[PDB]
Amino acid sequence: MDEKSTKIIMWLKKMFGDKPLPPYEVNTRTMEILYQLAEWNEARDKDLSLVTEDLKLKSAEVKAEAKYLQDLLTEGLGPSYTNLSRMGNNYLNQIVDSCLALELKNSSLSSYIPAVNDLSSELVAIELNNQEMEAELTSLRKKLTEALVLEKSLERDLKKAEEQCNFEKAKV
Amino acid sequence: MAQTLQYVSSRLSMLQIDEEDLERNAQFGKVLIELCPLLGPNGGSANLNRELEETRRELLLQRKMWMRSEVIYQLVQEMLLDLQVRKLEGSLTEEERKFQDGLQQCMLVSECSRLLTADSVPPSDSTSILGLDKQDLLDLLPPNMLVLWVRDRLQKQLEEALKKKCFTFLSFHQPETDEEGDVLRAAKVLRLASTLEDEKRRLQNEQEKHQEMRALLEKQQEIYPHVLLRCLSLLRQAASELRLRAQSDIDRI
Amino acid sequence: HRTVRKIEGNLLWYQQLQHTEAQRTAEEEQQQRRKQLCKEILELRAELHHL
Amino acid sequence: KLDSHLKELRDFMYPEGNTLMLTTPELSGEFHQLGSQLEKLNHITVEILG
Amino acid sequence: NVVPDEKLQAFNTLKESGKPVLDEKALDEVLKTFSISKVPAIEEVAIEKLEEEVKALQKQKNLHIRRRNKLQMVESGNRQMCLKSKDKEEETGRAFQEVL
Amino acid sequence: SKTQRALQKNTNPDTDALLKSLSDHYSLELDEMVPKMQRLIQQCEKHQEYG
């Protein structure tokens, strides 16, 4: 308990920085909750750091490739490939924006088609699952309400029954 | 207190905190509220989450630039493949053939020039592959008049190809649009990216709703058995203490 | 205050319940159609899963 | 299981569905009948003594 | 502290309806289970909703059928293109042997 | 686990044991008490005739 306590205090000091640690009730339960939270935060912070560093690397690599392709196209097709008509540019932007929206690896149909299908399938699947859960919540709520009514009716009937028994006991 | 719990449970969805915990421990609840801003919705530190969002934006910008070029590159490759297939089927016009040969040659020279130019640093001393310089490849380009002609024709062909690709994207997402005219299809294409983003946003909202409903269901499943047990306890009392004992004695007397 | 909460709470609760029940009585008559639609929905979901 | 236990105990204690029954209905009926017959016997006795 | 005449009448009606009046403790328990959020009265999936669902699923079915057909076209087209690309590989392979 | 612990604390007597006790008691009343009462009713009728 003494080790978990030390970990929590160190973790709280890290989170609150230069601000005095607020006084809180130190009991077995508050310590367990704080401990789970501290473990969770530490594990997530580690994961997020690794993801952030990787994204930086990927940003550099994508930039390098973009330059490469731009240079390749300029040398091969001339500067004129960048002088598309207003509508041409609009079409290009829409393809680009659609691909970014679906987080695709490339602009090929082999990537676009499965992505659109997955998006549509996931949306339907979740909507059905939400309907089913809503029915279950309503059903359980009804069961719970009936049970609560029953509980109150039983309390009343039991009190009446106890009074009646006492009255009869006096008669006996 | 109920508000504090809702707030903490929404932000710290992993914490199993009951109302009894916050009632017995008021100062602890204050600590959790203060911790909530310091902890992102996913349990990570707020600073690190901010850094992550910034780094994601940067990547998205770079990716947008790369994709622009990538779309053109792929279209050109697809165009070349289509023209090649038509050339083998004997259906290509002499002008198309010249265009195809000229464009293929321009791209190839460019690709190979780059293979040679390891953008490396002039080292005045670096041995080229096969001893070839960029100039050796430029000599294999078609005549300058044909290159300019190919580049002018490519612009019109590229716009047509971009249009065809957009229509295909649209036709797959909204197959009902195939029965519509080119003008209406072009209007719908201009909204396609936004429609797809909306659908993605809808999915995210429905997932959040799902998580909320799930949390409520779990609460109800926790309360319901206890209520049944209280009812059972009352009935047991009526049966054991009143019917088998109190009333049975009365009936006998 | 206590009496007001009790009164309002019960009203609220049963209102919510009744609202839930009243919706049901109309529902018994419509049950055969509901079974048919549920059967149809199951059949369509199975077809959609195959597709 | 809890729901089944509750339903079984309740059915036993509420045979007519609306009232908690502590005495066996068959027995309750006999007590009433016996009380009525004793009241008649007491009248006849009083009448004869009178 | 004020209970309007309407709520009082409604509550009296509730008392008269023979429904058990839930005590404060019971109300607290049940109301907890109540998300403020307007969870729209589960409009009990009005036959209409099921009908709407059947319509929605039929629309989805039609959509999947159209998309499957399109995919089959794209797949046939790609298969043909892949065969022809193999022929190109053979032609380019001959040209490469000429250069050697 | 909380619900199981609550069931064990509240289980003296076992619901099944209690239902059995209730059923036995019911049978005992029909076999012994009900006939006794019928006999007494009959005896009272005879005493009336004696009157």
XYZ file of C-alpha atoms in Angstrom:
677
model
C 0.000 0.000 0.000
C 2.945 2.099 0.685
C 4.330 1.478 -2.914
C 0.991 2.276 -4.708
C 0.713 5.366 -2.493
C 4.109 6.591 -3.575
C 3.240 6.049 -7.241
C 0.019 8.027 -6.913
C 1.671 10.947 -5.103
C 4.427 11.112 -7.757
C 1.838 10.872 -10.521
C -0.340 13.645 -9.007
C 2.752 15.823 -8.614
C 3.529 15.306 -12.278
C -0.043 16.108 -13.408
C -0.540 19.210 -11.138
C 3.027 20.508 -11.821
C 3.792 23.688 -9.685
C 0.236 23.742 -8.138
C -0.057 22.469 -4.533
C -1.669 19.051 -4.464
C -5.295 19.532 -3.337
C -6.182 17.780 -0.029
C -8.375 14.704 -0.561
C -9.735 11.860 1.710
C -7.078 9.058 1.603
C -8.976 5.790 1.978
C -8.530 2.341 0.489
C -11.144 3.018 -2.270
C -9.902 6.534 -3.308
C -6.389 5.118 -3.530
C -7.488 2.184 -5.738
C -9.348 4.496 -8.131
C -6.416 6.884 -8.333
C -4.045 4.050 -8.791
C -6.119 2.609 -11.792
C -6.304 6.039 -13.265
C -2.548 6.596 -12.834
C -1.787 3.242 -14.538
C -4.157 3.995 -17.354
C -2.772 7.496 -17.932
C 0.811 6.311 -17.905
C 0.079 3.524 -20.388
C -1.875 5.919 -22.741
C 0.788 8.673 -22.483
C 3.350 6.142 -23.647
C 1.192 5.035 -26.574
C 0.396 8.638 -27.625
C 4.099 9.588 -27.563
C 4.983 6.737 -29.845
C 2.108 7.642 -32.251
C 3.071 11.352 -32.233
C 6.713 10.583 -33.109
C 5.727 8.276 -35.862
C 3.366 10.810 -37.404
C 6.248 13.296 -37.482
C 8.349 10.789 -39.317
C 5.533 9.972 -41.729
C 4.951 13.705 -42.357
C 8.584 13.977 -43.435
C 8.451 10.967 -45.646
C 5.234 12.116 -47.349
C 6.745 15.509 -47.923
C 9.771 13.941 -49.542
C 7.691 11.822 -51.835
C 5.491 14.730 -52.753
C 8.522 16.610 -53.882
C 9.700 13.661 -55.828
C 6.438 13.197 -57.713
C 6.133 16.892 -58.370
C 9.585 16.978 -59.854
C 8.956 13.870 -61.884
C 5.762 15.282 -63.339
C 7.316 18.696 -64.043
C 10.199 17.158 -65.892
C 8.035 14.634 -67.751
C 4.781 16.593 -68.460
C 6.067 20.190 -68.181
C 4.658 22.965 -65.969
C 1.449 22.818 -67.978
C 0.036 19.880 -65.904
C -0.389 22.402 -63.061
C -2.407 24.833 -65.432
C -5.676 22.883 -65.364
C -9.046 24.681 -66.042
C -11.181 25.792 -63.108
C -13.374 22.653 -63.580
C -10.363 20.447 -63.897
C -9.015 21.759 -60.631
C -12.387 21.240 -59.009
C -12.479 17.637 -60.148
C -8.930 17.087 -58.861
C -9.763 18.640 -55.449
C -12.880 16.496 -55.088
C -10.962 13.272 -55.725
C -8.251 14.398 -53.343
C -10.719 15.454 -50.652
C -12.727 12.215 -51.053
C -9.610 10.111 -50.657
C -8.537 12.101 -47.561
C -11.990 11.746 -46.067
C -11.809 7.882 -46.380
C -8.083 7.910 -45.269
C -7.060 5.921 -48.418
C -3.519 4.819 -49.310
C -3.954 6.008 -52.857
C -6.536 7.298 -55.389
C -7.044 3.863 -57.092
C -10.552 2.316 -57.414
C -9.243 -0.708 -55.544
C -8.877 1.463 -52.514
C -11.959 3.713 -52.927
C -14.478 0.914 -53.491
C -13.776 -1.159 -50.403
C -13.606 2.031 -48.272
C -17.037 3.228 -49.342
C -18.481 -0.234 -48.764
C -16.953 -0.528 -45.312
C -18.217 2.990 -44.328
C -21.759 2.114 -45.458
C -21.701 -1.362 -43.802
C -20.358 -0.002 -40.491
C -22.937 2.783 -40.381
C -25.837 0.288 -40.867
C -24.353 -2.221 -38.465
C -23.992 0.362 -35.677
C -27.421 1.872 -36.278
C -28.987 -1.655 -35.923
C -26.942 -2.348 -32.875
C -28.130 0.975 -31.335
C -31.789 0.056 -32.102
C -31.329 -3.311 -30.471
C -29.764 -1.714 -27.406
C -32.540 0.863 -27.201
C -35.101 -1.989 -27.149
C -33.164 -3.753 -24.450
C -32.944 -0.552 -22.344
C -36.722 0.034 -22.725
C -37.476 -3.597 -21.914
C -35.300 -3.586 -18.793
C -36.699 -0.257 -17.700
C -40.205 -1.776 -17.870
C -39.063 -4.801 -15.921
C -37.417 -2.601 -13.361
C -40.560 -0.351 -13.024
C -42.794 -3.441 -12.582
C -40.489 -4.783 -9.986
C -40.379 -1.497 -8.083
C -44.230 -1.344 -8.128
C -44.349 -4.856 -6.896
C -41.940 -4.012 -4.085
C -44.182 -1.177 -2.877
C -47.331 -3.268 -3.176
C -45.704 -6.067 -1.161
C -44.611 -3.605 1.568
C -48.200 -2.359 1.881
C -49.754 -5.794 1.821
C -47.259 -7.073 4.395
C -48.048 -4.152 6.772
C -51.789 -4.797 6.429
C -51.222 -8.437 6.922
C -49.156 -7.831 10.082
C -51.935 -5.568 11.516
C -54.561 -8.090 10.730
C -52.536 -10.864 12.399
C -52.017 -8.714 15.513
C -55.723 -7.995 15.674
C -56.509 -11.687 15.428
C -53.906 -12.579 17.996
C -55.709 -10.240 20.407
C -58.984 -11.979 19.668
C -57.430 -15.403 20.215
C -23.045 15.564 -6.790
C -24.917 13.737 -9.527
C -23.570 16.367 -11.965
C -20.012 15.806 -10.795
C -20.407 12.061 -11.386
C -21.852 12.524 -14.857
C -19.023 14.853 -15.754
C -16.333 12.546 -14.451
C -17.929 9.427 -16.018
C -18.213 11.100 -19.413
C -14.587 12.183 -19.473
C -13.163 9.262 -17.596
C -15.273 6.508 -19.116
C -12.948 3.873 -17.617
C -13.540 4.819 -14.035
C -16.027 2.860 -12.227
C -17.201 5.587 -9.767
C -20.381 5.261 -7.841
C -22.390 8.072 -6.124
C -21.449 6.473 -2.715
C -17.815 7.063 -3.494
C -18.295 10.831 -4.099
C -20.752 11.230 -1.066
C -18.237 9.710 1.390
C -15.302 11.453 -0.230
C -16.300 15.126 -1.141
C -12.675 16.441 -1.356
C -11.758 13.459 -3.629
C -14.511 14.452 -6.071
C -12.892 17.938 -6.308
C -9.629 16.347 -7.141
C -11.232 14.290 -9.982
C -12.881 17.441 -11.460
C -9.512 19.160 -11.425
C -7.874 16.134 -13.017
C -10.489 15.912 -15.869
C -9.056 18.901 -17.855
C -5.575 17.641 -17.300
C -6.608 14.283 -18.673
C -7.898 14.102 -22.279
C -11.108 12.182 -23.175
C -8.976 9.118 -23.910
C -7.077 9.017 -20.605
C -4.001 10.632 -22.056
C -2.429 13.880 -20.855
C -4.049 17.014 -22.359
C -0.640 18.363 -23.554
C 0.243 15.213 -25.345
C -3.219 15.115 -26.963
C -2.754 18.673 -28.188
C 0.591 17.765 -29.634
C -0.902 14.756 -31.318
C -3.711 16.895 -32.942
C -1.128 19.416 -34.221
C 1.067 16.702 -35.628
C -2.028 15.156 -37.346
C -2.894 18.431 -39.030
C 0.587 18.747 -40.361
C 0.519 15.255 -41.770
C -2.901 15.999 -43.417
C -1.471 19.039 -45.209
C 1.470 17.128 -46.510
C -0.717 14.276 -47.520
C -3.013 16.661 -49.459
C -0.072 17.865 -51.484
C 1.215 14.408 -52.098
C -2.265 13.202 -53.141
C -2.636 15.920 -55.722
C 0.441 14.771 -57.446
C -0.329 11.139 -56.889
C -3.769 11.490 -58.599
C -2.229 12.965 -61.661
C 0.490 10.408 -61.736
C -1.927 7.522 -61.459
C -4.221 9.014 -64.099
C -1.355 9.326 -66.475
C -0.393 5.696 -65.846
C -3.949 4.568 -66.342
C -4.233 6.620 -69.485
C -1.068 5.091 -70.847
C -2.279 1.624 -70.046
C -5.638 2.250 -71.716
C -3.933 3.660 -74.866
C -1.578 0.673 -74.853
C -4.430 -1.756 -74.715
C -6.172 0.042 -77.555
C -2.932 0.039 -79.545
C -2.774 -3.819 -79.228
C -6.485 -4.076 -80.238
C -5.607 -2.152 -83.484
C -8.273 0.565 -82.560
C -5.844 3.499 -81.985
C -5.723 6.390 -84.530
C -2.391 7.396 -85.907
C -2.601 10.680 -83.841
C -3.321 8.725 -80.679
C -0.493 6.397 -81.362
C 1.945 9.336 -81.784
C 0.604 10.845 -78.603
C 0.894 7.589 -76.732
C 4.459 6.955 -77.941
C 5.491 10.549 -77.222
C 3.931 10.640 -73.736
C 5.325 7.195 -72.753
C 8.769 8.297 -73.923
C 8.658 11.594 -72.033
C 7.639 9.833 -68.796
C 10.218 7.112 -69.197
C 13.021 9.621 -69.819
C 11.953 11.587 -66.839
C 11.799 8.466 -64.630
C 15.192 7.294 -65.795
C 16.724 10.792 -65.421
C 15.840 10.700 -61.903
C 17.308 7.254 -61.418
C 20.577 8.785 -62.516
C 20.327 12.119 -60.567
C 20.497 10.762 -57.014
C 19.748 14.383 -55.988
C 22.806 13.707 -54.172
C 25.250 16.674 -53.658
C 27.194 17.431 -56.882
C 29.997 15.375 -55.838
C 31.894 16.373 -59.022
C 33.168 12.717 -58.498
C 30.128 10.454 -58.408
C 30.175 7.548 -60.942
C 26.849 7.450 -62.792
C 25.193 4.151 -63.627
C 26.528 2.858 -66.886
C 28.415 6.212 -67.042
C 25.328 7.940 -68.227
C 24.577 11.619 -67.538
C 21.222 13.356 -67.677
C 22.110 14.765 -71.023
C 22.524 11.270 -72.506
C 18.918 10.538 -71.745
C 17.576 13.932 -72.913
C 18.910 13.034 -76.340
C 16.489 10.171 -76.519
C 13.498 12.545 -76.200
C 11.304 12.979 -79.217
C 11.814 16.115 -81.260
C 11.027 19.333 -79.278
C 8.001 20.016 -81.660
C 6.490 16.647 -80.746
C 7.160 17.123 -76.989
C 5.275 20.481 -76.915
C 2.458 18.934 -78.923
C 2.216 16.002 -76.496
C 2.164 18.353 -73.398
C -0.637 20.569 -74.984
C -2.740 17.551 -75.860
C -2.169 15.990 -72.437
C -3.912 18.886 -70.643
C -7.220 18.216 -72.466
C -6.867 14.508 -71.983
C -6.018 14.846 -68.294
C -9.202 16.979 -67.597
C -11.300 14.451 -69.424
C -9.734 11.643 -67.452
C -10.252 13.548 -64.149
C -13.914 13.955 -65.093
C -14.240 10.278 -65.897
C -12.666 9.288 -62.604
C -14.917 11.601 -60.557
C -17.957 10.230 -62.333
C -16.851 6.719 -61.526
C -16.399 7.621 -57.819
C -19.841 9.126 -57.824
C -21.394 6.242 -59.778
C -20.167 3.803 -57.201
C -21.175 5.869 -54.115
C -24.550 6.816 -55.742
C -25.287 4.266 -58.473
C -28.727 6.022 -59.042
C -26.781 8.974 -60.615
C -25.834 6.810 -63.687
C -29.374 7.617 -65.079
C -28.681 11.416 -64.645
C -27.192 13.863 -67.266
C -23.436 15.001 -67.119
C -24.394 18.433 -65.760
C -26.236 16.971 -62.766
C -23.487 14.427 -62.159
C -20.858 17.240 -62.166
C -22.934 19.087 -59.478
C -23.146 16.008 -57.366
C -19.456 15.334 -57.696
C -18.698 18.783 -56.291
C -20.462 17.628 -53.069
C -19.182 14.083 -52.942
C -16.256 14.758 -50.504
C -18.544 16.679 -48.121
C -21.166 13.900 -48.307
C -18.604 11.281 -47.445
C -17.336 13.426 -44.514
C -20.891 13.747 -43.244
C -21.346 10.037 -43.407
C -18.141 9.571 -41.454
C -19.288 12.137 -38.887
C -22.627 10.314 -38.657
C -20.838 7.061 -37.944
C -18.770 8.804 -35.138
C -21.973 10.244 -33.577
C -23.722 6.880 -33.743
C -20.694 5.233 -32.056
C -20.818 7.834 -29.241
C -24.566 7.169 -28.870
C -23.816 3.518 -28.674
C -21.354 3.989 -25.862
C -23.860 6.113 -23.909
C -26.575 3.560 -24.312
C -24.291 0.885 -23.258
C -23.403 2.778 -20.056
C -27.120 3.193 -19.245
C -27.837 -0.450 -19.883
C -25.069 -1.455 -17.499
C -26.569 0.795 -14.800
C -29.969 -0.707 -15.210
C -28.532 -4.255 -15.073
C -26.860 -3.331 -11.833
C -30.108 -1.958 -10.143
C -32.674 -4.503 -11.355
C -31.353 -7.665 -9.504
C -31.261 -5.754 -6.184
C -34.827 -4.688 -6.597
C -35.857 -8.334 -7.236
C -33.964 -9.450 -4.148
C -35.817 -6.840 -1.997
C -39.168 -8.158 -3.322
C -38.132 -11.735 -2.640
C -37.072 -10.766 0.875
C -40.560 -9.216 1.582
C -42.412 -12.283 0.241
C -40.211 -14.563 2.290
C -41.113 -12.622 5.361
C -44.829 -12.899 4.620
C -44.595 -16.663 4.017
C -42.303 -17.643 6.904
C -43.271 -15.197 9.679
C -46.945 -14.610 8.920
C -48.445 -17.675 7.156
C -46.347 -20.658 8.610
C -46.025 -19.206 12.066
C -48.405 -16.364 13.202
C -51.506 -17.341 11.207
C -51.063 -21.092 11.654
C -51.102 -20.598 15.494
C -54.189 -18.479 15.292
C -56.094 -21.019 13.198
C -55.249 -23.798 15.638
C -56.537 -21.897 18.720
C -40.631 20.072 -0.964
C -40.634 16.434 -0.257
C -44.332 16.133 -1.066
C -43.928 18.166 -4.246
C -41.050 15.841 -5.443
C -43.087 12.812 -4.617
C -46.072 14.161 -6.477
C -44.072 15.410 -9.464
C -41.780 12.393 -9.472
C -44.620 9.912 -9.537
C -46.412 11.857 -12.100
C -43.309 12.099 -14.154
C -42.519 8.447 -13.726
C -45.985 7.166 -14.566
C -46.323 9.651 -17.291
C -43.232 8.186 -18.765
C -44.494 4.702 -18.133
C -48.087 5.418 -19.377
C -46.587 7.068 -22.360
C -44.731 3.915 -22.835
C -47.963 1.731 -22.079
C -50.613 3.747 -23.993
C -48.349 3.286 -27.002
C -48.573 -0.414 -26.362
C -52.427 -0.954 -26.345
C -52.720 0.433 -29.793
C -49.877 -2.008 -30.535
C -51.626 -5.319 -29.695
C -54.025 -4.935 -32.585
C -51.011 -4.257 -34.881
C -49.088 -7.336 -33.665
C -49.802 -9.647 -36.644
C -48.473 -6.940 -38.935
C -45.489 -6.492 -36.634
C -44.645 -10.185 -36.741
C -44.933 -10.086 -40.528
C -42.662 -7.005 -40.745
C -40.173 -8.524 -38.260
C -40.150 -11.720 -40.391
C -39.571 -9.569 -43.452
C -36.793 -7.554 -41.758
C -35.013 -10.807 -40.669
C -35.334 -12.162 -44.225
C -33.978 -8.873 -45.687
C -31.033 -8.749 -43.167
C -30.101 -12.314 -44.109
C -30.226 -11.341 -47.807
C -28.179 -8.223 -47.138
C -25.582 -10.321 -45.210
C -25.349 -12.752 -48.267
C -24.909 -9.778 -50.668
C -33.515 -17.397 -11.445
C -34.436 -14.509 -9.280
C -37.402 -13.706 -11.472
C -38.560 -17.366 -11.307
C -38.235 -17.524 -7.514
C -40.172 -14.369 -7.133
C -42.966 -15.530 -9.501
C -43.295 -18.952 -7.721
C -43.495 -17.487 -4.223
C -45.876 -14.766 -5.265
C -48.243 -17.265 -7.004
C -48.297 -19.300 -3.862
C -49.059 -16.380 -1.530
C -51.498 -14.655 -3.876
C -53.721 -17.449 -5.104
C -56.680 -15.063 -6.216
C -54.056 -12.622 -7.644
C -55.125 -9.589 -5.582
C -54.891 -10.372 -1.956
C -52.170 -11.735 0.228
C -53.621 -14.934 1.679
C -52.424 -16.112 5.035
C -55.067 -18.775 5.700
C -55.930 -21.723 3.561
C -59.147 -20.708 1.710
C -60.586 -24.133 2.374
C -60.003 -23.734 6.052
C -61.299 -20.202 6.205
C -64.542 -21.380 4.679
C -64.930 -24.129 7.297
C -64.393 -21.713 10.226
C -67.133 -19.525 8.953
C -69.474 -22.472 8.496
C -68.765 -23.831 11.962
C -69.365 -20.389 13.562
C -72.684 -20.110 11.846
C -73.845 -23.557 12.952
C -72.847 -22.844 16.619
C -74.851 -19.675 16.614
C -77.952 -21.666 15.572
C -77.281 -24.271 18.278
C -77.011 -21.486 20.948
C -80.455 -20.080 19.880
C -82.161 -23.362 20.149
C -80.639 -23.829 23.641
C -81.696 -20.418 24.906
C -85.129 -20.899 23.441
C -85.654 -24.247 25.305
C -84.327 -22.879 28.685
C -86.544 -19.904 28.336
C -43.577 24.605 -2.790
C -46.359 25.385 -5.162
C -48.227 22.459 -6.881
C -50.562 23.672 -9.541
C -54.174 22.569 -9.400
C -53.584 20.457 -12.532
C -50.730 18.381 -11.043
C -52.675 17.882 -7.827
C -55.677 16.649 -9.783
C -53.441 14.424 -11.895
C -51.785 12.948 -8.784
C -55.243 12.378 -7.150
C -56.313 10.614 -10.262
C -53.130 8.509 -10.058
C -53.961 7.629 -6.399
C -57.518 6.780 -7.466
C -56.254 4.670 -10.380
C -55.067 2.110 -7.728
C -51.404 2.457 -8.956
C -48.942 2.380 -6.184
C -47.518 5.842 -5.418
C -43.600 5.351 -5.401
C -41.924 6.747 -2.263
C -39.115 9.193 -2.592
C -36.452 6.391 -2.288
C -38.034 4.348 -5.011
C -38.467 7.424 -7.237
C -34.788 8.316 -6.732
C -33.776 4.821 -7.837
C -35.912 4.823 -10.891
C -35.323 8.371 -11.940
C -31.541 7.693 -11.859
C -32.120 5.369 -14.536
C -33.670 8.302 -16.450
C -31.114 10.059 -18.716
C -32.315 13.702 -18.920
C -31.492 13.367 -22.493
C -34.730 13.666 -24.487
C -34.254 10.164 -25.384
C -37.215 10.580 -27.635
C -39.883 8.409 -26.259
C -38.879 5.366 -27.974
C -41.670 5.871 -30.318
C -42.344 2.155 -30.007
C -41.150 1.276 -33.398
C -44.564 2.360 -34.833
C -45.429 -0.347 -37.533
C -44.408 2.746 -39.374
C -40.911 2.571 -38.173
C -40.677 -1.113 -38.961
C -42.161 -0.290 -42.345
C -39.648 2.452 -42.648
C -37.011 -0.036 -41.661
C -38.228 -2.505 -44.283
C -38.082 0.376 -46.804
C -34.697 1.406 -45.620
C -33.379 -2.219 -45.804
C -34.914 -2.634 -49.296
C -33.163 0.538 -50.365
C -29.969 -0.762 -48.921
C -30.511 -4.140 -50.626
C -30.981 -2.358 -53.984
C -27.968 -0.325 -53.379
C -25.784 -3.400 -52.568
C -27.145 -5.117 -55.704
C -26.168 -2.096 -57.839
C -22.792 -1.788 -56.245
C -22.185 -5.591 -56.668
C -23.009 -5.241 -60.357
C -20.715 -2.368 -60.745
C -17.967 -4.199 -58.990
C -18.456 -7.195 -61.238
C -18.058 -4.878 -64.233
C -14.981 -3.286 -62.839
C -13.620 -6.728 -61.974
C -14.259 -8.053 -65.573
C -12.754 -4.961 -66.990
C -9.670 -5.240 -64.766
C -9.318 -8.969 -65.554
C -9.216 -8.126 -69.271
C -6.772 -5.342 -68.643
C -4.511 -7.647 -66.550
C -4.382 -10.198 -69.515
C -3.474 -7.556 -71.943
C -0.875 -6.106 -69.581
C 0.781 -9.602 -69.620
C 0.968 -9.299 -73.431
C 2.680 -5.924 -73.024
C 5.126 -7.494 -70.635
C 5.929 -10.055 -73.372
C 6.330 -7.294 -76.065
C 8.503 -5.164 -73.871
C 10.459 -8.355 -73.012
C 11.177 -8.827 -76.797
C 12.216 -5.189 -77.228
C 14.555 -5.566 -74.275
C 16.139 -8.729 -75.936
C 16.719 -6.633 -79.099
C 18.600 -4.037 -77.178
C 20.742 -6.796 -75.535
C -20.514 -11.163 -6.954
C -22.357 -8.408 -5.020
C -25.692 -9.817 -6.139
C -24.690 -13.424 -5.175
C -23.532 -12.235 -1.769
C -26.827 -10.442 -1.308
C -28.714 -13.661 -2.261
C -26.751 -15.780 0.288
C -27.417 -13.215 3.145
C -31.074 -13.103 2.305
C -31.350 -16.950 1.743
C -32.318 -18.080 5.325
C -34.653 -19.980 4.343
C -33.809 -21.133 0.799
C -36.735 -20.029 -1.506
C -37.092 -23.703 -2.609
C -37.121 -24.813 0.998
C -39.612 -22.192 1.839
C -41.991 -23.202 -1.021
C -41.721 -26.809 0.197
C -42.555 -25.792 3.713
C -45.468 -23.837 2.457
C -46.779 -26.708 0.355
C -46.425 -29.172 3.327
C -48.211 -26.855 5.660
C -51.041 -26.468 3.115
C -51.408 -30.280 2.851
C -51.399 -30.657 6.604
C -54.259 -28.226 6.978
C -56.450 -30.023 4.377
C -55.708 -33.505 5.824
C -56.046 -32.763 9.519
C -57.698 -29.420 10.195
C -60.329 -29.256 7.440
C -61.737 -32.759 8.245
C -61.737 -31.950 11.994
C -63.765 -28.858 11.304
C -66.202 -30.867 9.132
C -66.626 -33.352 11.905
C -67.424 -30.592 14.348
C -69.968 -29.112 11.899
C -71.668 -32.450 11.654
C -71.736 -32.855 15.447
C -73.367 -29.467 15.830
C -76.069 -30.470 13.373
C -76.813 -33.577 15.471
C -77.035 -31.530 18.663
C -79.615 -29.337 16.961
C -81.689 -32.321 16.214
C -81.337 -33.353 19.874
C -82.726 -29.970 20.850
